[PDB]
Design a protein around this ligand. Structure first.
Ligand SMILES: Cc1oc(-c2ccccc2)nc1CCn1ccn(-c2ccnn2-c2ccccc2)c1=O
Ligand SMILES: [Mg+2]
Ligand SMILES: [Zn+2]
Length: 313
């Protein structure tokens, strides 16, 4: 109870900022997450013994892949922490509980391959889950870990509160399927502009939480340039492995996954910022004004990719 987590001064200050990088010391990431739960949710939200056992089981079930790894899980949870802390009174007690856990669990047991590669491979998961294949798997893995003895961090919730929080986590994790993002943002855009957007309407909250999940998931594009640029290498390390595996199935991959087309990465990032990232943080900033620093950092990184193309870096 009286056992707080405390970070060194630089981390205590910088963790509050959207653009915080969790650093290369893996052994500090569990402490960083508990710190964020305690400040976001409270020292009472979870039994520390159960939370610590949940965290280490989640870590164990992330794989040693270039990008979709334990560091990504904690990075996405921190972006959610920053949004929740800058939007104090907008979110319920259960929502703050659910979303930090949802973010930590959102890519559980990722193999570094897209839904599309699972389908073309004819992976068993593609027969079990026809759409949002990996995301249904990520939710399935979350429930499994929650049901390990001593791992049920929600035990002190009532039956209906427990069902509500698992429903928050399920929708939050499905929403990280980027294929669903385009339509979710368009609906939120129309709702905001026509003025029909209502945060007491559960279906509306669900959409807002979905966009928050996309925003946290894409948050590598909202870091300082050197972090964004170095994270890009890990992202493309996976894309190019998938492209290799597409070639082994006798299918030319999209250029984004074809390592022979490394040259075109700068223009590819531009399209992505313009088509996905900037739209995402613009709509998020309209709905939740205090998330504007994510939009600003994203615009700064767009400007940096424009400089790469112009030969200035
Ligand atoms: C559209 C395009 O075309 C090229 C390209 C490159 C080289 C040659 C020819 C084309 N590159 C891109 C953009 C690449 N791209 C896609 C998602 N992310 C991303 C950013 C943060 N998270 N994620 C993310 C990663 C995995 C899964 C989900 C999300 C990302 O960087
Ligand atoms: Mg994912
Ligand atoms: Zn992710």
């Amino acid at each position: 109870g009286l056992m707080q987590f405390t970070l060194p001064v630089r981390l205590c200050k910088e963790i509050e900022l959207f653009h915080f990088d969790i650093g290369p010391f893996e052994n500090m990431w569990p402490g960083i997450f508990v710190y964020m739960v305690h400040r976001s949710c409270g020292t009472s939200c979870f039994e520390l013994e159960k939370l610590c056992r949940f965290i280490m089981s989640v870590k164990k079930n992330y794989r040693r892949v270039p990008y979709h790894n334990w560091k990504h899980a904690v990075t996405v949870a921190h972006c959610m922490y920053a949004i929740l802390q800058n939007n104090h009174t907008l979110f319920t007690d259960l929502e703050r509980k659910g979303l930090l856990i949802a973010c930590l669990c959102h890519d559980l047991d990722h193999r570094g391959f897209s839904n599309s590669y699972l389908q073309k491979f004819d992976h068993p998961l593609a027969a079990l889950y026809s759409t949002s294949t990996m995301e249904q798997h990520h939710f399935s893995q979350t429930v499994s870990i929650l049901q390990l003895e001593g791992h049920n961090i929600f035990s002190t919730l009532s039956s209906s509160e427990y069902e509500q929080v698992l429903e928050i986590i399920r929708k939050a994790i499905i929403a990280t399927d980027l294929a669903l993002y385009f339509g979710n943002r368009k609906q939120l855009e129309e709702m905001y502009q026509t003025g029909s957007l209502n945060l007491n309407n559960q279906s509306h909250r669900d959409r807002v939480i979905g966009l928050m999940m996309t925003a946290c998931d894409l948050c590598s594009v909202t870091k300082l340039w050197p972090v964004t640029k170095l994270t890009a290498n890990d992202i493309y390390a996976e894309f190019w492995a998938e492209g290799d595996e597409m070639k082994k199935l006798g299918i030319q991959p999209i250029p984004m996954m074809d390592r022979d087309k490394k040259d075109e990465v700068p223009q590819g990032q531009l399209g992505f910022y313009n088509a996905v990232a900037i739209p995402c943080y613009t709509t998020l900033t309209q709905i939740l004004p205090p998330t504007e620093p994510l939009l600003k950092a994203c615009r700064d990184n767009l400007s940096q990719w424009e400089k790469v193309i112009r030969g200035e870096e």
